[PDB]
Ligand binder design. Structure first.
Ligand SMILES: CC[C@H](C)[C@@H]1NC(=O)[C@@H](NC[C@@H](O)[C@H](Cc2ccccc2)NC(=O)OC(C)(C)C)Cc2ccc(cc2)OCCCNC1=O
Lengths: 99, 99
């Protein structure tokens, strides 16, 4: 679909058999999801954005469905105000910026 | 034009007579520009990202040219590692997400 930016580009995603709202973020290199239990092992990691660095759990090869479109990649779980779908997954579903 | 997300969507912008490289961020409610001496009255403001909040100076009605596309709106100036063009200005240049 074609999404305008008058409102936050929030879409429903399915991760770990659970439905959640996530923000399509072209400014984010990675995908950061709120605290939740995801199957498989995880490795401690640190990422940084506008107001500093945070500690996150890194889960690899996690299947994520974004608006019916499939993607399998790295998902970071940590303290975030909103679920963020970054460029690592956006590229998998062929998302592009147009104007 | 059509911008892919293989790399960070960085484009050239013109603000206050200067040319800068800025990141097209659909996940940003506001536009945040690196520290610079813009004339005019400003209002103190605090914006939050991943990691926390930072103090910024709010300037209204600032004309910004994005990739040759004219726009004008609120620009926040503060300690940011990258210049960020948010939805407030992206909507003005007819930018959309497509997949
Ligand atoms: C300037 C950023 C903008 C002000 C802020 N948006 C954002 O910061 C959104 N995009 C993240 C992008 O703005 C930054 C850009 C950046 C790149 C490199 C170094 C530093 C910063 N990327 C970024 O944080 O990447 C991560 C998530 C993988 C760590 C994500 C988000 C959304 C809502 C949030 C908090 C965070 O909380 C909701 C409040 C509104 N916050 C916002 O709209």
């Amino acid at each position: 679909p074609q999404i305008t930016l008058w409102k936050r580009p929030l879409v429903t995603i399915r991760i770990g058999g659970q439905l959640k709202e996530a923000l399509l973020d072209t400014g984010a290199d990675d995908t950061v999801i709120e605290e939740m239990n995801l199957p498989g092992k995880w490795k401690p990691k640190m990422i940084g954005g506008i107001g500093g660095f945070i500690k996150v759990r890194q889960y690899d090869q996690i299947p994520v469905e974004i608006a019916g479109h499939k993607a399998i990649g790295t998902v970071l779980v940590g303290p975030t105000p909103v679920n963020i779908i970054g460029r690592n997954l956006l590229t998998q579903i062929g998302a592009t910026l147009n104007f």
